[PDB]
Design a protein around this ligand. Sequence first.
Ligand SMILES: CNCc1ccc2c(c1)[C@@H](CC[C@H](O)CO)[C@H](CNC(=N)N)[C@H]2NC(=O)C(=O)Nc1ccc(Cl)c(F)c1
Ligand SMILES: *[C@@H]1O[C@H](CO)[C@@H](O)[C@H](O)[C@H]1NC(C)=O
Ligand SMILES: *[C@@H]1O[C@H](CO)[C@@H](O)[C@H](O)[C@H]1NC(C)=O
Ligand SMILES: *[C@@H]1O[C@H](CO)[C@@H](O)[C@H](O)[C@H]1NC(C)=O
Ligand SMILES: *[C@@H]1O[C@H](CO)[C@@H](O)[C@H](O)[C@H]1NC(C)=O
Ligand SMILES: *[C@@H]1O[C@H](CO)[C@@H](O)[C@H](O)[C@H]1NC(C)=O
Ligand SMILES: *[C@@H]1O[C@H](CO)[C@@H](O)[C@H](O)[C@H]1NC(C)=O
Ligand SMILES: *[C@@H]1O[C@H](CO)[C@@H](O)[C@H](O)[C@H]1NC(C)=O
Length: 335
Amino acid sequence: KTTLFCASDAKAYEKEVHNVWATHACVPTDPNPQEMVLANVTENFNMWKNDMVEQMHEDIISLWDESLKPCVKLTGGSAITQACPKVSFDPIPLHYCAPAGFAILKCNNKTFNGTGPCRNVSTVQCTHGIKPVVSTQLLLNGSLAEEEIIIRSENLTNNAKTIIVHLNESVNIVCTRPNNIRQAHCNINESKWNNTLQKVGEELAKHFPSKTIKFEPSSGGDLEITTHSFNCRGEFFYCNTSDLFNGTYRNGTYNHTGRSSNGTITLQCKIKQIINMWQEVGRAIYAPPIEGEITCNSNITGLLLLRDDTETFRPGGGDMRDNWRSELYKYKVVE
Ligand SMILES: CNCc1ccc2c(c1)[C@@H](CC[C@H](O)CO)[C@H](CNC(=N)N)[C@H]2NC(=O)C(=O)Nc1ccc(Cl)c(F)c1
Ligand SMILES: *[C@@H]1O[C@H](CO)[C@@H](O)[C@H](O)[C@H]1NC(C)=O
Ligand SMILES: *[C@@H]1O[C@H](CO)[C@@H](O)[C@H](O)[C@H]1NC(C)=O
Ligand SMILES: *[C@@H]1O[C@H](CO)[C@@H](O)[C@H](O)[C@H]1NC(C)=O
Ligand SMILES: *[C@@H]1O[C@H](CO)[C@@H](O)[C@H](O)[C@H]1NC(C)=O
Ligand SMILES: *[C@@H]1O[C@H](CO)[C@@H](O)[C@H](O)[C@H]1NC(C)=O
Ligand SMILES: *[C@@H]1O[C@H](CO)[C@@H](O)[C@H](O)[C@H]1NC(C)=O
Ligand SMILES: *[C@@H]1O[C@H](CO)[C@@H](O)[C@H](O)[C@H]1NC(C)=O
């Protein structure tokens, strides 16, 4: 309804590009903030129609555009050329804050699905701290649901609308390019994944009860969405998930079809130089990888899925606003 401002706990003395950007663009965070609880008020939210998501998307585009400058950027006809130094890159949490005369309403219902009326509302001045993690297929390093796993979607009947699965227990994913320079791998504990997908299958079953629930790899698209793509320490990883989204939840029970080995699923990854931009329709070319080992140790806290008797779910993503929504769903700007 208005322009918000960001608060961060950044350094003016870290090189780290999120810190640098935040110190120019954000004010410091309040040491202990004010919350007001209003259980009686009961208010409507719609996470799919949230101006905060667009404000954040604008900001993260700015951050990346100042911070991960490509050597060449191809948009439409033009090519744009510039210094592309290797940088230290590790997302930091950002708080979105209502300016004077406005507030931010938090929905406090642990099982709120992001849409409709919420009973226990709070009013606050800033959101919690959200790390702006850009990625596809798997949401990384977010905040978990307190209770159950929530299933969010603008329209679950519309199979074109992205489904956000909000997890209540994180699943570790470790991705490394060890010390072929492009080639890397990720390890996930197959038991832990096995479980998580048991219970996602349960929740999806509640919303589609006659059908049998299948997980299958991403059918088609650019590499950025047919793989789990993400930025680790400045390098763009593209990780094959066909052993991850590969299972059936039949009748109260999940089978995992992808292989594992010693009880780990290992995804093969490539580090790539030509990137299809998430900010706009265009290509970006970056310099070859830094040497050393590049390793990111991340929590999977959510999934982005797309639905095609049986219902079949594929990993999705590509619109980073869905990543922001997964964090901003319980917030609304008012007054
Ligand atoms: C779900 N709706 C379908 C769908 C699907 C894929 C994509 C979109 C929409 C566009 C969304 C644009 C948005 O509206 C911007 O405002 C976006 C266009 N971009 C092009 N080059 N064609 C395109 N997504 C990407 O390319 C992308 O995610 N790449 C990428 C790179 C680096 C990293 Cl690390 C990364 F994790 C991801
Ligand atoms: C979310 O909850 C609302 C009611 O609050 C309901 O109308 C809607 O269908 C639900 N959506 C999902 C995806 O569960
Ligand atoms: C998480 O939610 C699932 C599905 O909603 C539920 O079955 C499970 O008991 C919950 N687990 C934890 C650890 O909270
Ligand atoms: C969402 O689903 C379909 C679109 O396929 C349509 O009936 C309408 O847009 C929505 N329906 C419901 C029940 O919300
Ligand atoms: C989950 O993974 C563990 C470890 O590999 C395995 O022993 C168990 O049977 C699996 N459960 C399934 C596939 O339902
Ligand atoms: C992932 O790996 C499988 C088998 O290794 C292959 O069939 C599939 O095309 C790969 N997907 C991508 C996007 O590389
Ligand atoms: C599941 O994995 C196996 C081997 O890991 C592969 O042969 C199969 O094609 C995968 N399933 C799908 C639907 O791709
Ligand atoms: C997730 O957080 C950990 C700890 O801050 C970090 O090491 C890791 O690189 C993060 N993952 C991504 C993809 O940013």
